[PDB]
Amino acid sequence: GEYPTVSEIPVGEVRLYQIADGVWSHIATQSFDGAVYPSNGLIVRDGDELLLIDTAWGAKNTAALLAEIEKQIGLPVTRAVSTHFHDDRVGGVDVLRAAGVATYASPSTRRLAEVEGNEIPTHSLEGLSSSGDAVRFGPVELFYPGAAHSTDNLVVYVPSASVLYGGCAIYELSRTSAGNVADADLAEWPTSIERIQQHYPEAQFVIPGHGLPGGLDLLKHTTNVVKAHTNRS
Numbered sequence: 001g002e003y004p005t006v007s008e009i010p011v012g013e014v015r016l017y018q019i020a021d022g023v024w025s026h027i028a029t030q031s032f033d034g035a036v037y038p039s040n041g042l043i044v045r046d047g048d049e050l051l052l053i054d055t056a057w058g059a060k061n062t063a064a065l066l067a068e069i070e071k072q073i074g075l076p077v078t079r080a081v082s083t084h085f086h087d088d089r090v091g092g093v094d095v096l097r098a099a100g101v102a103t104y105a106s107p108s109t110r111r112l113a114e115v116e117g118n119e120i121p122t123h124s125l126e127g128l129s130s131s132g133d134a135v136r137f138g139p140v141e142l143f144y145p146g147a148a149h150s151t152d153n154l155v156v157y158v159p160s161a162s163v164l165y166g167g168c169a170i171y172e173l174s175r176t177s178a179g180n181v182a183d184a185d186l187a188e189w190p191t192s193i194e195r196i197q198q199h200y201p202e203a204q205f206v207i208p209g210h211g212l213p214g215g216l217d218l219l220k221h222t223t224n225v226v227k228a229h230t231n232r233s
């Protein structure tokens with residue numbers, strides 16, 4: 001149905017959106033600099049358990065996310081993966097850890113999170129140190145496409161449902177301007193996007209880090225936005 005928008009989600013609340021069977025996205029809202037922003041994560045069913053991808057951007061949001069998951073799906077979230085080190089992906093890891101969730105991130109993400117003073121996922125994800133690396137983690141595949149939105153960003157693919165979760169390295173179609181690119185690699189971002197396209201050409205649903213899902217067109221759109229911002233246009 002109608003994908004949850006930022007104007008339909010109260011402060012501190014979380015909505016779930018079933019993309020395919022056993023694949024949900026969780027949508028929360030955060031406000032800063034006078035504007036309010038939506039944010040996406042992923043929930044993938046893993047037998048009788050659930051694998052969570054990224055927090056709900058904040059401790060209060062994440063606590064509500066776990067409560068919503070508990071009320072809606074009613075299956076235990078045993079593992080969680082943060083796709084990069086910024087607050088919208090690791091903010092709430094301490095809440096997850098306190099509830100017994102095992103938190104995971106690449107060694108690059110954990111290091112950059114500690115330097116930033118953010119919350120630090122406990123477990124380290126091996127085998128994702130070089131561009132193009134891919135490892136299977138439960139019911140999903142983790143992919144390091146190279147530096148883009150950040151040097152450590154990962155993308156997540158669900159081969160059971162052909163769902164690609166790009167994180168903040170992928171923009172929604174309505175977004176035509178780059179955001180917090182302070183830690184981005186504008187020079188490598190388009191090349192990293194092409195690695196995603198080359199590795200997941202069969203993806204049917206593409207989930208951006210923020211906003212409405214779509215198809216693989218979101219990849220070229222992100223490349224166009226990054227190239228436009230590169231030339232200061």
Ligand SMILES: O=c1cc(CP(=O)(O)O)c2c(Br)cc(Br)cc2[nH]1
Pocket residue numbers: 037086088168178179180181209210
């Ligand atoms: O500074 C920012 C940070 C974000 C969060 P992000 O960098 O993780 O995408 C942001 C977003 Br979502 C949308 C817009 Br319009 C502007 C933004 N400005």
Ligand SMILES: [Zn+2]
Pocket residue numbers: 084086149150168180
């Ligand atoms: Zn970020």
Ligand SMILES: [Zn+2]
Pocket residue numbers: 102122123
């Ligand atoms: Zn553990």
Ligand SMILES: [Zn+2]
Pocket residue numbers: 088167168209210
């Ligand atoms: Zn983001």
Ligand SMILES: [Zn+2]
Pocket residue numbers: 173220221222224
């Ligand atoms: Zn476009």
